[PDB]
């Protein structure tokens, strides 16, 4: 079995190997990359996402989210308070202000320590989940707006044509902006490109051990667990590496820098934080290997998780027994 310790693997494809996206994902899996839940892909030196980022300031962040924490430093939830619209140029200025900027630090490890010690005492503002793309249309390789769609994958594998679309999302971050522990909708893959700015630190639980994380979460968030049998779908709970280690949960960590891709694999729980002002682009995707995960994915029906239009068909076709209950939670 390849990668039996479930370590995060880092790949350096050549420009030739960067042509065929599906083929390269399958290669990484042949080497055991999915066992970690997360892989890093450093593009060939010849590649670029676009020519420059000099002209992005007028993008609008219609609903910036202030991420307010409750709990203790290593075990907390966050809620998202909506803020007034602002442009990317306005948000960058805010991220660089004395109130929100990255503190002085020695290295990524020192900054990580500072994040876990102090995150709860601040409320950073995240420009998350903005439909759009920063890839140039002429970028042919690993262009996250030009991937094969999940609807087409399901049709190819299963023969059923379904409605829905699959487009990318932009994320503008600042110091301490946080992504809570989650798997993707329908336990899909994700791919995330860090276009510019400061790093993003990731934590991940191997898919084979995801249920260990879920059991800890139920213990640590006991009211939330009574409310919903899949409350991590709400994407609000944080647990620190120290708490994970104290509770014997297998995990790994890595820091993504600008110009790098990360892939999350089906049922790979992940969480993390941004070091400072940055912009990432991410999208979900599927492969043949996903189908069995999609069929088994948990679902939130309590009403909290509310998701896209396109998840309807995935539930309806892959999980017909669950469909009626899940759709009630959507309405
Ligand atoms: O970058 C973020 O805030 C969160 N991204 C992801 O969870 C992802 O790409 O799957
Ligand atoms: Mg602009
Ligand atoms: Ni994710
Ligand atoms: Zn729920």
PDB file of C-alpha atoms in Angstrom, residues 18-162:
ATOM      1  CA  UNK A  18       0.679  19.397 -16.407  1.00  0.00           C
ATOM      2  CA  UNK A  19      -1.370  18.976 -19.554  1.00  0.00           C
ATOM      3  CA  UNK A  20      -3.766  16.323 -18.542  1.00  0.00           C
ATOM      4  CA  UNK A  21      -5.409  17.158 -15.208  1.00  0.00           C
ATOM      5  CA  UNK A  22      -7.347  13.943 -14.692  1.00  0.00           C
ATOM      6  CA  UNK A  23      -4.334  11.825 -15.540  1.00  0.00           C
ATOM      7  CA  UNK A  24      -2.166  13.664 -12.992  1.00  0.00           C
ATOM      8  CA  UNK A  25      -4.742  13.274 -10.195  1.00  0.00           C
ATOM      9  CA  UNK A  26      -4.841   9.579 -10.924  1.00  0.00           C
ATOM     10  CA  UNK A  27      -1.001   9.495 -10.851  1.00  0.00           C
ATOM     11  CA  UNK A  28      -0.921  11.192  -7.464  1.00  0.00           C
ATOM     12  CA  UNK A  29      -3.384   8.621  -6.158  1.00  0.00           C
ATOM     13  CA  UNK A  30      -1.226   5.795  -7.592  1.00  0.00           C
ATOM     14  CA  UNK A  31       1.479   7.114  -5.273  1.00  0.00           C
ATOM     15  CA  UNK A  32      -0.883   7.127  -2.242  1.00  0.00           C
ATOM     16  CA  UNK A  33      -1.435  10.879  -2.057  1.00  0.00           C
ATOM     17  CA  UNK A  34      -5.087  10.595  -1.188  1.00  0.00           C
ATOM     18  CA  UNK A  35      -4.357   8.707   1.953  1.00  0.00           C
ATOM     19  CA  UNK A  36      -3.325  12.031   3.585  1.00  0.00           C
ATOM     20  CA  UNK A  37      -6.526  13.822   2.586  1.00  0.00           C
ATOM     21  CA  UNK A  38      -4.478  16.682   1.091  1.00  0.00           C
ATOM     22  CA  UNK A  39      -1.622  17.072  -1.440  1.00  0.00           C
ATOM     23  CA  UNK A  40       0.416  20.019  -2.619  1.00  0.00           C
ATOM     24  CA  UNK A  41       1.152  20.555  -6.348  1.00  0.00           C
ATOM     25  CA  UNK A  42       3.916  23.007  -7.300  1.00  0.00           C
ATOM     26  CA  UNK A  43       3.295  24.024 -10.952  1.00  0.00           C
ATOM     27  CA  UNK A  44       6.159  23.796 -13.499  1.00  0.00           C
ATOM     28  CA  UNK A  45       8.324  26.877 -13.660  1.00  0.00           C
ATOM     29  CA  UNK A  46       7.051  27.698 -17.150  1.00  0.00           C
ATOM     30  CA  UNK A  47       3.426  27.991 -16.003  1.00  0.00           C
ATOM     31  CA  UNK A  48       1.483  30.996 -14.857  1.00  0.00           C
ATOM     32  CA  UNK A  49      -2.124  31.563 -13.858  1.00  0.00           C
ATOM     33  CA  UNK A  50      -2.274  35.015 -15.434  1.00  0.00           C
ATOM     34  CA  UNK A  51       0.181  37.783 -16.397  1.00  0.00           C
ATOM     35  CA  UNK A  52      -0.213  40.080 -13.378  1.00  0.00           C
ATOM     36  CA  UNK A  53      -2.452  40.782 -10.402  1.00  0.00           C
ATOM     37  CA  UNK A  54      -2.147  44.540 -10.848  1.00  0.00           C
ATOM     38  CA  UNK A  55      -5.721  45.111 -11.893  1.00  0.00           C
ATOM     39  CA  UNK A  56      -7.893  43.205  -9.266  1.00  0.00           C
ATOM     40  CA  UNK A  57      -8.706  46.025  -6.894  1.00  0.00           C
ATOM     41  CA  UNK A  58     -12.112  46.721  -8.294  1.00  0.00           C
ATOM     42  CA  UNK A  59     -13.513  43.228  -7.682  1.00  0.00           C
ATOM     43  CA  UNK A  60     -16.381  43.570  -5.199  1.00  0.00           C
ATOM     44  CA  UNK A  61     -16.702  41.629  -2.008  1.00  0.00           C
ATOM     45  CA  UNK A  62     -20.493  42.067  -1.661  1.00  0.00           C
ATOM     46  CA  UNK A  63     -20.749  40.436   1.736  1.00  0.00           C
ATOM     47  CA  UNK A  64     -17.529  40.399   3.758  1.00  0.00           C
ATOM     48  CA  UNK A  65     -17.838  38.122   6.754  1.00  0.00           C
ATOM     49  CA  UNK A  66     -16.530  39.015  10.272  1.00  0.00           C
ATOM     50  CA  UNK A  67     -15.584  35.764  11.919  1.00  0.00           C
ATOM     51  CA  UNK A  68     -16.542  35.995  15.600  1.00  0.00           C
ATOM     52  CA  UNK A  69     -15.314  33.202  17.880  1.00  0.00           C
ATOM     53  CA  UNK A  70     -16.790  31.619  21.045  1.00  0.00           C
ATOM     54  CA  UNK A  71     -15.154  29.026  23.282  1.00  0.00           C
ATOM     55  CA  UNK A  72     -11.618  28.452  24.368  1.00  0.00           C
ATOM     56  CA  UNK A  73      -8.432  29.036  22.436  1.00  0.00           C
ATOM     57  CA  UNK A  74      -8.113  25.475  21.165  1.00  0.00           C
ATOM     58  CA  UNK A  75     -11.793  24.537  20.950  1.00  0.00           C
ATOM     59  CA  UNK A  76     -14.095  27.185  19.541  1.00  0.00           C
ATOM     60  CA  UNK A  77     -16.840  27.927  17.087  1.00  0.00           C
ATOM     61  CA  UNK A  78     -17.097  30.921  14.791  1.00  0.00           C
ATOM     62  CA  UNK A  79     -20.109  32.707  13.368  1.00  0.00           C
ATOM     63  CA  UNK A  80     -20.129  34.916  10.423  1.00  0.00           C
ATOM     64  CA  UNK A  81     -21.422  38.453  10.820  1.00  0.00           C
ATOM     65  CA  UNK A  82     -22.217  40.124   7.520  1.00  0.00           C
ATOM     66  CA  UNK A  83     -20.515  43.468   6.857  1.00  0.00           C
ATOM     67  CA  UNK A  84     -21.060  46.157   4.272  1.00  0.00           C
ATOM     68  CA  UNK A  85     -19.691  45.634   0.763  1.00  0.00           C
ATOM     69  CA  UNK A  86     -16.232  46.646  -0.098  1.00  0.00           C
ATOM     70  CA  UNK A  87     -13.825  46.388  -3.031  1.00  0.00           C
ATOM     71  CA  UNK A  88     -10.717  44.192  -3.014  1.00  0.00           C
ATOM     72  CA  UNK A  89      -8.644  47.419  -2.820  1.00  0.00           C
ATOM     73  CA  UNK A  90     -10.584  48.528   0.229  1.00  0.00           C
ATOM     74  CA  UNK A  91     -10.275  45.059   1.799  1.00  0.00           C
ATOM     75  CA  UNK A  92      -6.527  44.919   1.187  1.00  0.00           C
ATOM     76  CA  UNK A  93      -6.123  48.266   2.943  1.00  0.00           C
ATOM     77  CA  UNK A  94      -8.170  46.969   5.840  1.00  0.00           C
ATOM     78  CA  UNK A  95      -6.135  43.737   6.067  1.00  0.00           C
ATOM     79  CA  UNK A  96      -2.910  45.869   6.212  1.00  0.00           C
ATOM     80  CA  UNK A  97      -4.261  48.183   8.929  1.00  0.00           C
ATOM     81  CA  UNK A  98      -2.817  48.140  12.406  1.00  0.00           C
ATOM     82  CA  UNK A  99      -5.998  46.471  13.785  1.00  0.00           C
ATOM     83  CA  UNK A 100      -5.858  43.501  11.322  1.00  0.00           C
ATOM     84  CA  UNK A 101      -2.292  43.102  10.040  1.00  0.00           C
ATOM     85  CA  UNK A 102      -0.076  40.101  10.660  1.00  0.00           C
ATOM     86  CA  UNK A 103       2.064  40.621  13.799  1.00  0.00           C
ATOM     87  CA  UNK A 104       5.793  40.437  13.816  1.00  0.00           C
ATOM     88  CA  UNK A 105       6.939  36.863  13.855  1.00  0.00           C
ATOM     89  CA  UNK A 106      10.038  34.709  13.357  1.00  0.00           C
ATOM     90  CA  UNK A 107       8.812  32.055  10.980  1.00  0.00           C
ATOM     91  CA  UNK A 108       5.653  30.063  10.093  1.00  0.00           C
ATOM     92  CA  UNK A 109       5.854  28.035  13.293  1.00  0.00           C
ATOM     93  CA  UNK A 110       5.943  31.137  15.485  1.00  0.00           C
ATOM     94  CA  UNK A 111       2.972  32.552  13.570  1.00  0.00           C
ATOM     95  CA  UNK A 112       1.086  29.289  14.004  1.00  0.00           C
ATOM     96  CA  UNK A 113       1.681  29.479  17.757  1.00  0.00           C
ATOM     97  CA  UNK A 114       0.382  33.013  17.806  1.00  0.00           C
ATOM     98  CA  UNK A 115      -2.707  32.014  15.776  1.00  0.00           C
ATOM     99  CA  UNK A 116      -3.722  29.286  18.195  1.00  0.00           C
ATOM    100  CA  UNK A 117      -2.960  31.368  21.263  1.00  0.00           C
ATOM    101  CA  UNK A 118      -4.784  34.460  20.163  1.00  0.00           C
ATOM    102  CA  UNK A 119      -7.279  33.789  17.379  1.00  0.00           C
ATOM    103  CA  UNK A 120     -10.353  33.845  19.598  1.00  0.00           C
ATOM    104  CA  UNK A 121      -9.617  37.359  20.822  1.00  0.00           C
ATOM    105  CA  UNK A 122     -10.013  38.917  17.435  1.00  0.00           C
ATOM    106  CA  UNK A 123     -12.648  38.950  14.716  1.00  0.00           C
ATOM    107  CA  UNK A 124     -10.978  39.030  11.263  1.00  0.00           C
ATOM    108  CA  UNK A 125     -13.014  39.771   8.120  1.00  0.00           C
ATOM    109  CA  UNK A 126     -12.982  37.140   5.309  1.00  0.00           C
ATOM    110  CA  UNK A 127     -14.062  37.806   1.663  1.00  0.00           C
ATOM    111  CA  UNK A 128     -15.127  34.234   1.073  1.00  0.00           C
ATOM    112  CA  UNK A 129     -17.144  32.399  -1.406  1.00  0.00           C
ATOM    113  CA  UNK A 130     -17.194  34.982  -4.297  1.00  0.00           C
ATOM    114  CA  UNK A 131     -18.225  33.402  -7.639  1.00  0.00           C
ATOM    115  CA  UNK A 132     -15.528  34.148 -10.202  1.00  0.00           C
ATOM    116  CA  UNK A 133     -12.038  33.345 -11.522  1.00  0.00           C
ATOM    117  CA  UNK A 134      -8.634  34.973 -11.788  1.00  0.00           C
ATOM    118  CA  UNK A 135      -7.232  32.487 -14.305  1.00  0.00           C
ATOM    119  CA  UNK A 136      -6.541  34.027 -17.711  1.00  0.00           C
ATOM    120  CA  UNK A 137      -8.714  32.447 -20.358  1.00  0.00           C
ATOM    121  CA  UNK A 138      -5.593  31.621 -22.268  1.00  0.00           C
ATOM    122  CA  UNK A 139      -4.134  29.524 -19.420  1.00  0.00           C
ATOM    123  CA  UNK A 140      -4.799  26.021 -20.653  1.00  0.00           C
ATOM    124  CA  UNK A 141      -3.290  23.903 -17.878  1.00  0.00           C
ATOM    125  CA  UNK A 142      -4.891  23.635 -14.422  1.00  0.00           C
ATOM    126  CA  UNK A 143      -7.263  26.456 -15.111  1.00  0.00           C
ATOM    127  CA  UNK A 144      -9.883  26.038 -12.337  1.00  0.00           C
ATOM    128  CA  UNK A 145     -12.562  27.635 -14.511  1.00  0.00           C
ATOM    129  CA  UNK A 146     -12.034  25.030 -17.308  1.00  0.00           C
ATOM    130  CA  UNK A 147     -12.222  21.779 -15.451  1.00  0.00           C
ATOM    131  CA  UNK A 148     -14.518  18.849 -16.415  1.00  0.00           C
ATOM    132  CA  UNK A 149     -17.752  19.338 -14.478  1.00  0.00           C
ATOM    133  CA  UNK A 150     -19.025  17.095 -11.705  1.00  0.00           C
ATOM    134  CA  UNK A 151     -22.314  16.726 -13.605  1.00  0.00           C
ATOM    135  CA  UNK A 152     -20.444  15.428 -16.599  1.00  0.00           C
ATOM    136  CA  UNK A 153     -18.446  13.028 -14.409  1.00  0.00           C
ATOM    137  CA  UNK A 154     -21.632  11.633 -12.866  1.00  0.00           C
ATOM    138  CA  UNK A 155     -23.085  11.252 -16.323  1.00  0.00           C
ATOM    139  CA  UNK A 156     -20.044   9.542 -17.662  1.00  0.00           C
ATOM    140  CA  UNK A 157     -19.852   7.099 -14.724  1.00  0.00           C
ATOM    141  CA  UNK A 158     -23.482   6.412 -14.044  1.00  0.00           C
ATOM    142  CA  UNK A 159     -25.238   7.298 -17.330  1.00  0.00           C
ATOM    143  CA  UNK A 160     -27.694   9.794 -15.871  1.00  0.00           C
ATOM    144  CA  UNK A 161     -27.849  13.340 -17.144  1.00  0.00           C
ATOM    145  CA  UNK A 162     -28.492  15.942 -14.481  1.00  0.00           C
TER     146      UNK A 162
END
